[PDB]
Enzyme design. Sequence first.
Site, short mmCIF file in Angstrom:
data_model
loop_
_atom_site.label_atom_id
_atom_site.label_comp_id
_atom_site.label_asym_id
_atom_site.label_seq_id
_atom_site.Cartn_x
_atom_site.Cartn_y
_atom_site.Cartn_z
N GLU A 165 -36.51 -47.34 19.56
CA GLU A 165 -37.69 -47.47 18.92
C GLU A 165 -38.35 -48.86 19.60
OE1 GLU A 165 -38.59 -46.00 15.96
OE2 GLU A 165 -40.27 -47.33 15.18
N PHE B 58 -24.67 -38.01 21.43
CA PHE B 58 -23.34 -37.08 22.05
C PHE B 58 -22.07 -37.90 22.07
CE2 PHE B 58 -27.65 -36.12 24.64
CZ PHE B 58 -27.93 -35.47 23.89
C1 LIG Z 1 -48.35 -43.91 12.10
C2 LIG Z 1 -49.29 -44.07 11.52
C3 LIG Z 1 -50.24 -45.34 12.02
C4 LIG Z 1 -50.61 -42.69 11.33
O1 LIG Z 1 -51.66 -43.19 10.32
P1 LIG Z 1 -51.57 -41.77 9.02
O2 LIG Z 1 -50.41 -41.10 9.11
O3 LIG Z 1 -52.48 -41.01 9.40
O4 LIG Z 1 -51.63 -42.51 7.61
P2 LIG Z 1 -53.02 -43.33 7.31
O5 LIG Z 1 -53.93 -43.45 8.57
O6 LIG Z 1 -53.68 -42.74 6.20
O7 LIG Z 1 -52.62 -44.83 7.00
C5 LIG Z 1 -51.32 -45.14 6.40
C6 LIG Z 1 -51.03 -46.48 6.40
O8 LIG Z 1 -50.59 -46.62 7.78
C7 LIG Z 1 -51.21 -48.13 8.15
N1 LIG Z 1 -51.89 -48.02 9.30
C8 LIG Z 1 -52.71 -46.78 9.56
N2 LIG Z 1 -53.52 -47.12 10.62
C9 LIG Z 1 -53.23 -48.38 10.78
C10 LIG Z 1 -53.90 -49.43 11.94
N3 LIG Z 1 -54.89 -48.77 12.82
N4 LIG Z 1 -53.58 -50.57 11.68
C11 LIG Z 1 -52.61 -51.01 10.86
N5 LIG Z 1 -51.91 -50.39 9.92
C12 LIG Z 1 -52.64 -49.06 9.99
C13 LIG Z 1 -51.67 -48.77 7.12
O9 LIG Z 1 -50.68 -49.50 6.37
C14 LIG Z 1 -52.04 -47.67 6.04
O10 LIG Z 1 -52.18 -47.82 4.77
P3 LIG Z 1 -53.52 -48.12 4.36
O11 LIG Z 1 -54.48 -47.22 5.02
O12 LIG Z 1 -53.64 -47.98 2.91
O13 LIG Z 1 -53.82 -49.47 4.90
C15 LIG Z 1 -49.17 -44.68 9.97
O14 LIG Z 1 -48.51 -43.51 9.47
C16 LIG Z 1 -47.84 -45.80 10.10
O15 LIG Z 1 -48.35 -46.92 10.23
N6 LIG Z 1 -46.59 -45.45 10.04
C17 LIG Z 1 -45.87 -46.76 9.74
C18 LIG Z 1 -45.42 -47.03 11.37
C19 LIG Z 1 -44.20 -48.09 11.51
O16 LIG Z 1 -44.21 -48.87 10.72
N7 LIG Z 1 -43.30 -48.00 12.52
C20 LIG Z 1 -42.20 -48.92 12.69
C21 LIG Z 1 -42.84 -50.30 13.22
S1 LIG Z 1 -42.89 -50.29 14.85
C22 LIG Z 1 -41.07 -50.59 15.80
C23 LIG Z 1 -41.11 -51.77 16.64
C24 LIG Z 1 -39.91 -52.35 16.62
C25 LIG Z 1 -39.72 -53.54 17.62
C26 LIG Z 1 -40.82 -54.07 18.12
O17 LIG Z 1 -40.70 -55.27 18.81
C27 LIG Z 1 -42.02 -53.54 18.02
C28 LIG Z 1 -42.16 -52.41 17.06
C1 LIG Z 2 -21.22 -35.41 17.40
C2 LIG Z 2 -19.96 -35.03 18.30
C3 LIG Z 2 -18.71 -35.21 17.16
C4 LIG Z 2 -20.02 -33.55 18.62
O1 LIG Z 2 -19.16 -33.31 19.68
P1 LIG Z 2 -19.84 -32.55 20.82
O2 LIG Z 2 -21.23 -32.87 21.03
O3 LIG Z 2 -19.46 -31.21 20.72
O4 LIG Z 2 -19.03 -33.46 21.80
P2 LIG Z 2 -17.15 -33.40 22.27
O5 LIG Z 2 -16.59 -32.75 21.15
O6 LIG Z 2 -17.02 -32.59 23.72
O7 LIG Z 2 -16.69 -34.85 22.40
C5 LIG Z 2 -17.73 -36.07 22.71
C6 LIG Z 2 -16.98 -37.38 22.29
O8 LIG Z 2 -17.30 -37.47 21.13
C7 LIG Z 2 -16.13 -37.93 20.33
N1 LIG Z 2 -15.62 -37.11 19.34
C8 LIG Z 2 -15.65 -35.91 19.33
N2 LIG Z 2 -14.85 -35.13 18.53
C9 LIG Z 2 -14.49 -36.39 17.84
C10 LIG Z 2 -13.37 -36.38 16.93
N3 LIG Z 2 -13.06 -35.26 16.20
N4 LIG Z 2 -12.94 -37.56 16.55
C11 LIG Z 2 -13.22 -38.53 17.16
N5 LIG Z 2 -14.25 -38.70 18.39
C12 LIG Z 2 -14.49 -37.60 18.62
C13 LIG Z 2 -15.27 -38.52 21.48
O9 LIG Z 2 -15.58 -39.60 21.91
C14 LIG Z 2 -15.48 -37.30 22.46
O10 LIG Z 2 -15.07 -37.52 23.83
P3 LIG Z 2 -13.72 -37.17 24.41
O11 LIG Z 2 -13.51 -35.74 23.87
O12 LIG Z 2 -13.98 -37.32 25.88
O13 LIG Z 2 -12.65 -38.25 23.90
C15 LIG Z 2 -19.87 -35.87 19.31
O14 LIG Z 2 -20.96 -35.77 20.00
C16 LIG Z 2 -19.94 -37.48 19.00
O15 LIG Z 2 -19.14 -37.93 18.35
N6 LIG Z 2 -21.16 -38.15 19.04
C17 LIG Z 2 -21.17 -39.87 18.68
C18 LIG Z 2 -21.38 -39.67 17.10
C19 LIG Z 2 -21.88 -41.10 16.84
O16 LIG Z 2 -21.35 -42.13 17.23
N7 LIG Z 2 -22.91 -41.35 15.72
C20 LIG Z 2 -22.80 -42.79 15.30
C21 LIG Z 2 -21.76 -43.33 14.60
S1 LIG Z 2 -21.72 -42.85 12.78
C22 LIG Z 2 -22.81 -43.88 11.86
C23 LIG Z 2 -22.51 -44.73 10.78
C24 LIG Z 2 -23.07 -45.76 10.22
C25 LIG Z 2 -22.92 -46.48 9.02
C26 LIG Z 2 -21.39 -46.30 8.61
O17 LIG Z 2 -20.99 -47.18 7.69
C27 LIG Z 2 -20.58 -45.10 8.89
C28 LIG Z 2 -21.24 -44.12 10.16
#
Ligand SMILES: CC(C)(COP(=O)(O)OP(=O)(O)OC[C@H]1O[C@@H](n2cnc3c(N)ncnc32)[C@H](O)[C@@H]1OP(=O)(O)O)[C@@H](O)C(=O)NCCC(=O)NCCSCc1ccc(O)cc1
Ligand SMILES: CC(C)(COP(=O)(O)OP(=O)(O)OC[C@H]1O[C@@H](n2cnc3c(N)ncnc32)[C@H](O)[C@@H]1OP(=O)(O)O)[C@@H](O)C(=O)NCCC(=O)NCCSCc1ccc(O)cc1
EC number: 3.1.2.23
Lengths: 139, 140, 139, 140
Positions: D63, D91
């Site tokens: 992001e 993956f």
């Molecule tokens: C995508 C977007 C702009 C599209 O607008 P929409 O779906 O048509 O909705 P909308 O146009 O009616 O406006 C909804 C709200 O969006 C915000 N917004 C919309 N257009 C703008 C704009 N041109 N400038 C500022 N805020 C805007 C406003 O808060 C608005 O509420 P308000 O009109 O009452 O002030 C709106 O849904 C949005 O802002 N969603 C939030 C996006 C977001 O917060 N993404 C996460 C932050 S970016 C990640 C990042 C991470 C690390 C970095 O270093 C930099 C960035």
């Molecule tokens: C989704 C999944 C299991 C699907 O399997 P696949 O696409 O068919 O791939 P694959 O089965 O051939 O295996 C790929 C690798 O995944 C891991 N994996 C697959 N199945 C298993 C299993 N049963 N146990 C452990 N690791 C597994 C292994 O690293 C495997 O590589 P290896 O066979 O060479 O050791 C596999 O792609 C995967 O493990 N991707 C990573 C998932 C991941 O890391 N999501 C983020 C972590 S969970 C988020 C979380 C956040 C806050 C919390 O408090 C708790 C959880």
Amino acid sequence: GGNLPDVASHYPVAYEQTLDGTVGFVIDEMTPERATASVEVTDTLRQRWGLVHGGAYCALAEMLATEATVAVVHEKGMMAVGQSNHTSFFRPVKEGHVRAEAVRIHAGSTTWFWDVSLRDDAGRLCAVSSMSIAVRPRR
Amino acid sequence: TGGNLPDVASHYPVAYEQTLDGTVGFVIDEMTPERATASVEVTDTLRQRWGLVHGGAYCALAEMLATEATVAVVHEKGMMAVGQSNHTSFFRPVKEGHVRAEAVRIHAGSTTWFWDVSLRDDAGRLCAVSSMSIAVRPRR
Amino acid sequence: GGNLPDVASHYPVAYEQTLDGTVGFVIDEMTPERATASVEVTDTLRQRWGLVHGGAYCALAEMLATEATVAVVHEKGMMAVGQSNHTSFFRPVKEGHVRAEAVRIHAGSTTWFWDVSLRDDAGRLCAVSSMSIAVRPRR
Amino acid sequence: TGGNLPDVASHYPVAYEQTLDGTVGFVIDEMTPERATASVEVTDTLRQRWGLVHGGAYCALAEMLATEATVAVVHEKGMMAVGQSNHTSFFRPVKEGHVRAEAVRIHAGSTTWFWDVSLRDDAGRLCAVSSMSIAVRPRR
Ligand SMILES: CC(C)(COP(=O)(O)OP(=O)(O)OC[C@H]1O[C@@H](n2cnc3c(N)ncnc32)[C@H](O)[C@@H]1OP(=O)(O)O)[C@@H](O)C(=O)NCCC(=O)NCCSCc1ccc(O)cc1
Ligand SMILES: CC(C)(COP(=O)(O)OP(=O)(O)OC[C@H]1O[C@@H](n2cnc3c(N)ncnc32)[C@H](O)[C@@H]1OP(=O)(O)O)[C@@H](O)C(=O)NCCC(=O)NCCSCc1ccc(O)cc1
Ligand SMILES: CC(C)(COP(=O)(O)OP(=O)(O)OC[C@H]1O[C@@H](n2cnc3c(N)ncnc32)[C@H](O)[C@@H]1OP(=O)(O)O)[C@@H](O)C(=O)NCCC(=O)NCCSCc1ccc(O)cc1
Ligand SMILES: CC(C)(COP(=O)(O)OP(=O)(O)OC[C@H]1O[C@@H](n2cnc3c(N)ncnc32)[C@H](O)[C@@H]1OP(=O)(O)O)[C@@H](O)C(=O)NCCC(=O)NCCSCc1ccc(O)cc1
């Protein structure tokens, strides 16, 4: 027919009667890591407003990525079906053809993932599809 | 009105029966600004070679429903609506009967509307879901 | 700690040292079909422009949906990990709290799916997450 | 420049080291209008309780990278850029080392830019991918 992978002796639905044969999807190349397909734009692929239906891109991508998976896994006792299809649209298509290119990016034991690109006759990127295909043993 | 799509224009480029929608038989049931329903009877035209409803069919039904539901409101306001993202997830296949879709609006911004679409079987089971993000822009 | 499901005697990383404990995520309710969590907005959750980081919503949703799956499946010999996380952003958050609600919509044998809603202090829908959780037998 | 993010402004609301980015240690390497890279050294701060890199960490790196990469070009043009959709697919897990991300621009529309982000491990394996859709709008 549509040049789909010939992996079984019988298929439940004939190509011409499937959604794919009805809109006219045809596989061009197919390898384990990459496949292509295309379709001629006709009103059968469009929505009432005259643009190629978004669902058409979705469907081309889904058939292409899934069938390309089937091509490898069928013979291994597995079934391949789409689990997730995420299609994003950048530019519409009004006429000509839709060409898709599916590139395999992950082939896991239970999931295969393909990046599909959908382009127009000018080669412009009109949409993309992230296809996640589930691979399971046949029943 | 051929498949009961919103009458917002006098004329349309392609007639219902000729479109993808008409060809596969999608039909809109209810339609409000925050919720819309539609359905389709499964036939071979909706299926893939393996006998199941094509994944692309669910994506298309959801796409048409969400978009047209947006069009119903915005067209008159001089906007055009087209999907920008369609993310469909498949939980259970459908072999026959109907596919019934329900689109619920969850966000209506100035440039994007977002609908959650649920696709069910005759037994009411949740077969697929689609997150539809619809761009809203002014017509040219 | 963060009120995460207590399913094992030992955990590789202590809550306070994890990404979750560092940003301050806390589980509120948890049942097999629904769970909630929340976080206080601090600069640790923001990006340089002062808004809550998009990645923060992603992370809250991922932890919440996954842990809620773990809660049921752990004791059954299974491992639960996120396979797909699709977060869509509707409105930003500058301060206050982020509250998430995860509703289970599918619990298959190999995949569980949760719809997560992320709201602000005013109750407005700021973002949503479609969480697809893979369920596999432990190794 | 704290994590080497684009210098497009004189001042920023939150300092690098205080943001989520700084806290987990994301650092931008290359940055061009069509491609950008960044990385992070894995530490417990990047992990979940089970010892693996948190899914949310990949989503955040992608992001930040895609958005900031868009900001680098559009800021000067008076636009603001924020993600509208982040779809990350996992993956293979990462237990230690680094997470290296590469964002490739695939579409640059007038209202949306789209980046494909690949997240790899030290061995170069594709661990996750993220499809980032960035809204581009004019600042208020
Ligand atoms: C995508 C977007 C702009 C599209 O607008 P929409 O779906 O048509 O909705 P909308 O146009 O009616 O406006 C909804 C709200 O969006 C915000 N917004 C919309 N257009 C703008 C704009 N041109 N400038 C500022 N805020 C805007 C406003 O808060 C608005 O509420 P308000 O009109 O009452 O002030 C709106 O849904 C949005 O802002 N969603 C939030 C996006 C977001 O917060 N993404 C996460 C932050 S970016 C990640 C990042 C991470 C690390 C970095 O270093 C930099 C960035
Ligand atoms: C989704 C999944 C299991 C699907 O399997 P696949 O696409 O068919 O791939 P694959 O089965 O051939 O295996 C790929 C690798 O995944 C891991 N994996 C697959 N199945 C298993 C299993 N049963 N146990 C452990 N690791 C597994 C292994 O690293 C495997 O590589 P290896 O066979 O060479 O050791 C596999 O792609 C995967 O493990 N991707 C990573 C998932 C991941 O890391 N999501 C983020 C972590 S969970 C988020 C979380 C956040 C806050 C919390 O408090 C708790 C959880
Ligand atoms: C993705 C998958 C396998 C994941 O399993 P899960 O989420 O863990 O759910 P689950 O394992 O508990 O089983 C749910 C149902 O899926 C089906 N299923 C699951 N595993 C299998 C399997 N190995 N063989 C057959 N059906 C299966 C069954 O209907 C099962 O229900 P049941 O156990 O009551 O008979 C399952 O959710 C599914 O089958 N969803 C439907 C997939 C679908 O229909 N995608 C569209 C069809 S393929 C597109 C295509 C287009 C053009 C072509 O030319 C070819 C293909
Ligand atoms: C989503 C949207 C509008 C966002 O614009 P963007 O990403 O910022 O890109 P952009 O603004 O630079 O413009 C790209 C192209 O989009 C089209 N476009 C953009 N804005 C407009 C507009 N206001 N009016 C018409 N076309 C437009 C134009 O073709 C433009 O190419 P051009 O500027 O050279 O004429 C643009 O990417 C797009 O149009 N993607 C195609 C969407 C699509 O075709 N979805 C499938 C059709 S709708 C499904 C449906 C099914 C059944 C029904 O009954 C009804 C609908």
